[model samples]
Target chain A: SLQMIVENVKLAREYALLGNYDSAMVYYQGVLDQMRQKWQQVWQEINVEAKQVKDIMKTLESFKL
Target chain B: DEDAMSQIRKGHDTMFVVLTSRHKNLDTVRAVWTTGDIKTSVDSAVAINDLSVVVDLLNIVNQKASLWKLDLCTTVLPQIEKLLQSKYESYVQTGCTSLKLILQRFLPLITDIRLHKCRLCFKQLKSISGLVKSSAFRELHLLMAS
Candidate 1:
């Protein structure tokens, strides 16, 4: 559902903003899985935020699970 | 006379400028779109039955979502809801599109204290129903789903 998807994205960003990258990563993953083609651009924006510069260096930017 | 009347009707353009300016003029990140600005814009646009500026404002609101508060939802959503049930098909489509964008952009910021109001708004929308048959309404319905 787009409602949940919207909520998921909302949570993802908030968690990111709150410096809780772990929770943010979980929400972002949920959003990524259900994205329709209509959401390609939105996904890109979300992906950028999910893998912040420091996250890649420490975690290898893996999207597994 | 015909050309003059058309120009007069387009005078609403000036009002649009002032409406947008109030938003643009804010000095910094406090993100206040003064109630007068929103109230005047919505009320005047509805009075004239003009969608051009109102819809444009909706787009602006979406782009600036990080700064929104429940104040925006309270003012804008009711009007958008009214438009969704409008007799005019174009109005319904515009309303659907606006509501969808508003929800997508604003959902993240909705506080727990105000969450029930959002749910209630969705329920009201679910009652008014369709596109008059655009995917806009379908998309709104999907987004409203849990």
Candidate 2:
């Protein structure tokens, strides 16, 4: 399911590029959920991708998203 | 020293004044602060590796962010970019990093929002996009993009 999570992250990036932060957030949340559901199988990958997500989320929040 | 001197020419906002006073000689907005001069004394130009100057610069800029954040992008931001060009030459030379090693060691430095320099640091990281456009830095570009 690593590929699944990556595909979802890619979707999030696409939504973001279209200036749809809300939709991107939806996709990002989906990726996060998928990651958590598969946590035991991909703990390291999950955290790494999660941190990158968290960083961008923080940036968006700082800019009042 | 000329190589470094040319580094001075990279930014339009900051100028390397033809003088011996390092802190005093910079023509960038970072050279002066709303509080006062950056240094207690005029003294000599700081060496490229002077961590204190960068720290002082960041602190003063952050201290006045409320008053001047608008000007910061064009003024202080470019100066900091110029300053980093000197401080982290290897970072500029490489254009990007997988951040694998840095994340393993300095993740908190980037992750911790409380750090005064985190915004500037991330801005710097993101700003290297132009340099990472080459095929040689494809991995780094991908890494930064992700």
Candidate 3:
């Protein structure tokens, strides 16, 4: 489903909140890497998804969540 | 535990109570989701290069992102750039306002690549002869500060 990407983000955050940073990073990187492969085909959605993931990572890093 | 998991599956609000011997705290972690319907319409509009719906969707996007605390600058900047380069002065004016909002709300979300293209948009706007030139100048001033 097109909504799978969003689920990845939620699951990633869940792992991060539980202090499983490595597992969380796996989810984040998985979605980002998948999106990159389709960069030209879905540039618009890719941009939004990338930005969202990066912003979440920033918050997680600074707050150590 | 099963109840919390089911609630999450159903898309209702629930608090994640992470209890462990090493860490004990009450941190509320909520999942954020924007309405896909509006996003779908925006996608369709973008496909057709429909300026009016594009502009309207951008406005809706601004509100939705604000409400959800989502950073959408990367997604919307190119759309705004298209509006800035539009022949209609009204769309350009709206683009100016939207750009200002993005600068205020999601300044950190803007990447170097997006900022580079944004500068080019302003440069083009500067050469245009009309009221838009003055507004573009103001936005460019703020852009430089960011």
RMSD values, in order shown: 18.8, 21.5, 19.4
Predicted structure with the largest DockQ when compared to the true one:
3
Extract clashing residue pairs from model 1.
none
Candidate 2 wrong stretches, greater than 4 Å:
A1-65, B1-104, B107-109, B112-114, B134-136
Pairs that collide, model 2? B22-B45
Instruction: Order candidates by lDDT, high to low.
Output: 1, 3, 2
Q: Can you write out model 1's per-residue Cα lDDT over B1-146, one digit (the tens) per residue?
A: 23322332243344334334432322111122343355444444444444443543454454444544544565567667677766666556657666766667665445233567676655545454443224566666677664
Ranking of predictions according to DockQ? 3, 1, 2
lDDT of 3 at A54: 48
Instruction: Supply candidate 1's per-residue lDDT for A37.
Output: 45
- Give the Å error, residue B35, model 2: 29
Per-residue lDDT over B21-128 for candidate 2, one digit per residue giving the tens place of the 0 to 100 score: 223322232333322443321121133434333333343233332333221332333334454344344333221221322323343546655344556555655665
| Stretches of model 3 off by over 4 angstroms after superposition | A1-65, B1-41, B63-71, B109-134
Worst 10 residues of 1 chain B by lDDT: B23-32
- Output the better candidate (2/3) by lDDT: 3
Task: Indicate which candidate wins on lDDT.
Answer: 1
User: Candidate 1 DockQ category?
Assistant: incorrect
Best by TM-score: 1
Model 3, A30-52: lDDT tens digits are 76675533334343443343344
